[PDB]
Design a protein around this ligand. Structure first.
Ligand SMILES: [Mg+2]
Lengths: 507, 84, 83
DNA sequence: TGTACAGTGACAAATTATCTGTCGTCGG
DNA sequence: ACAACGACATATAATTAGTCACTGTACATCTACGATACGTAGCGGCCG
DNA sequence: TGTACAGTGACTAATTATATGTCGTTGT
DNA sequence: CGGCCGCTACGTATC
């Protein structure tokens, strides 16, 4: 290869040598050039042989030949190899696994071996630091390494399969994951609840935020189903959100890309994906999915750090007043966060581009305007019970609840596919297999509960209590084990009440 | 020691639960060797002249009289009254 | 250091009006023949500015010279090195 | 090619207290 | 006779190991645990 | 006046690759 | 007396 070297910051001594060399650039004659050397021996206080060496160092190296080169020992240690290997490997072994041995502690191991070997000059602690110095800088550098980024309109998302998804247009690849927000919220009475969970759905091509879910609720394939319908459907917000632009963003993904959480690697999201026709894809590392993750730092920096009750990004940065200074309810935080996403965030510049907004790039990036799906057809969100069988008397029994259906007595002994809503299990949609296809059969209803609404976590909590209470299984008996615990509080029920009040304001 | 958790969660070695090995009896063997042979034998700061133990022992107003172990019955809890 | 204190030759010095400068850097001047009192100067763009006097604390009344304080310090280091 | 917002070096422009001429005034 | 290069000797700051006074930051109850999913096994009721 | 250990500027001693003379040798 | 089929319970994995 090519091998060049250039001098810099030359002057401090070297300008005197440079002026000597400038006076000597030409062998004018054998008589005169010797006189020029013997004259230069007045500017440098040195013999003819020192000036002849200077001229040879200049002619063979150029300007660096004026500068004094560093000694051959620079960076080598005089303590001998035994001690240099003992010190290096002792450090490394002592920082193996969970151990975090300090150089001082390494020096103690040096004095201990020197005592065993009857040495008299075990390296001093100051020299231990020096010997370990280079392998500490490396560690600090290896943490600090920057990565460039996608540049221009071309983007290839890596999966856990080693396949890359080429992101060609708007709604080609959506992405999703969850996080805690960093604000403690209060109930409608001003008492502490908990820090909400935020879900975001993003389109990869435009980086526009295509939908959210905010709530005290837990990450679940239900919260993902709700984030999906909010992303897919056309969006409506009332004047109490004070929006000055529209979240005009909707339609159905071709692919959905996620971390490996049990919300996403689930049969429920598989069934949603098969019915909507989108393919579920797995993120290979957290560092591949920055389009999901980075909305979250921006929101900490642009929104949540400026709100009362802020908790910091971690426990070492927690404002000590966070538990006393909380003020917002979930309905206030959503009314702030939705505004932020519609008026600010989707209207800001797409950073890869510099000359489009995130929304402008999404809208112009559709291959065609997609048709709005009917709100009833989002019943593909309903969970599937795969292999329950019809009992004689036209009956289905399910999470203790017993169901009756309009044609269902025709199919006693047969196997049926049941589609249901975890928010309301009073009613079941019954499908059956015919010609190796599902066909709709009937809207079965929990007998004697046709006037009544049970969510699955209520029927489940009532069943747990009923099992442990030792009472019999029936549709009312389960309702009886709800209505007391309803009427008679526990943080999850208090959270659920505030979350419900937000869902009411959605209607 | 194996199983070190760092000072707080931000330092927690990812292997802390993979690398735990000591029983409570073994940690106490180590901790008492350390306190007797090392910590109480180190030089007292705020002085520099004296070993920490030597400063305790020379510091005494008098040699204390040992208390018979049975006379640490005083450590028993009192139930302030019961009525016969 | 807090309350207007400085460390010099292992002695601790307390400044007369210095307490407002805690956590600041100051420079300082003294006569080697007698380091019981030290003169503290604030640092500025082309100048040192005289700030206040500071006096040694916890020492014997007899006036302390600089060479004598170095000696006290090497006696402590020698004693520590016996352990 | 992970990612995108806030903080930070590097450079340019308008304003003002400060350094320089030139002249006038006063003292030795 | 003049200039350039090497042998040999001699003095020299760069580098490293060591010592010392001043200072920064942890000790100050605290992440194993909660919340989802799947995958497999079990309990009695109903039928042969 | 919290409290005491590990890391850090500031200075010094031992070692060495390196710059300087001085002379011998060779080319011109 | 023996076998088959809904609703609970334990074990494992991941954010
Ligand atoms: Mg995740």
């Amino acid at each position: 290869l090519e091998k060049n070297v250039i001098a810099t910051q030359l002057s401090e001594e070297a300008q005197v040598k440079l002026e000597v060399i400038q006076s000597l650039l030409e062998p004018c004659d054998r008589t005169t050039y010797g006189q020029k050397l013997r004259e230069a021996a007045e500017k440098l206080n040195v013999s003819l042989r020192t000036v002849q060496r200077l001229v040879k160092n200049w002619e063979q190296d150029g300007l660096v030949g004026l500068t004094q080169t560093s000694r051959a020992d620079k960076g080598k240690h005089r303590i001998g190899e035994f001690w240099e290997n003992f010190i290096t490997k002792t450090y490394k072994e002592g920082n193996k696994g969970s151990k975090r041995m300090t150089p001082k502690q390494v020096a103690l191991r040096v004095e201990a071996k020197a005592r065993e070997l009857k040495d008299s000059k075990p390296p001093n602690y100051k020299t231990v630091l020096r010997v370990l110095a280079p392998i500490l800088e490396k560690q600090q550098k290896a943490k600090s390494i920057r990565s460039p980024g996608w540049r221009g309109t071309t983007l290839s998302v890596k999966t856990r399969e080693g396949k890359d998804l080429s992101v060609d247009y708007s709604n080609h690849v959506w992405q999703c994951d969850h996080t805690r927000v960093d604000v403690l919220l209060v109930d409608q009475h001003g008492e502490i609840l908990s820090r909400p969970w935020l879900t975001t759905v993003i389109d990869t091509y435009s980086r526009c935020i295509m939908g959210i879910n905010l709530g005290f609720d837990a990450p679940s394939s239900g919260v993902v189903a709700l984030a999906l319908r909010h992303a897919i459907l056309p969006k409506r917000y009332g004047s109490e959100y004070k929006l000055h632009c529209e979240w005009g963003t909707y339609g159905k993904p071709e692919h959905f890309y996620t971390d490996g959480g049990k919300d996403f690697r689930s049969n429920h999201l598989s069934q949603i994906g098969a019915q909507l026709g989108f393919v579920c894809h797995l993120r290979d590392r957290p560092s591949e999915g920055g389009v999901v993750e980075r909305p979250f730092k921006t929101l900490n920096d642009q929104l949540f750090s400026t709100l009362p009750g802020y908790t910091g990004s971690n426990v070492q940065e927690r404002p000590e007043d966070a538990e006393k200074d909380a003020r917002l309810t979930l309905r206030e935080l959503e009314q702030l966060l939705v505004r932020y996403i519609v008026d600010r965030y989707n209207q800001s510049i797409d950073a890869r581009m510099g000359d489009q907004t995130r929304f402008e790039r999404w809208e112009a990036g559709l291959p065609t305007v997609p048709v709005p799906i009917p709100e009833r057809d989002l019943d593909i969100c309903l969970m599937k019970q795969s292999r329950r069988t019809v009992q004689r008397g036209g009956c289905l029994q399910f999470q203790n609840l017993m169901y009756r259906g309009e044609y269902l007595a025709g199919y006693a002994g047969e196997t049926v596919n049941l589609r249901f809503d975890p928010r309301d299990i009073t009613t079941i949609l019954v499908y059956r297999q015919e010609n190796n296809q599902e066909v709709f059969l009937t809207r079965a209803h929990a007998q004697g509960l046709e006037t009544e609404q049970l969510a699955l976590d209520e029927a489940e909590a009532a069943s747990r209590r009923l099992r442990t209470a030792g009472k019999t299984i029936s549709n009312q008996s389960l309702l009886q084990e709800v209505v007391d615990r309803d009427a008679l509080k526990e943080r999850q029920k208090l959270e659920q009440t505030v979350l419900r009040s937000a869902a009411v304001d959605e209607s």
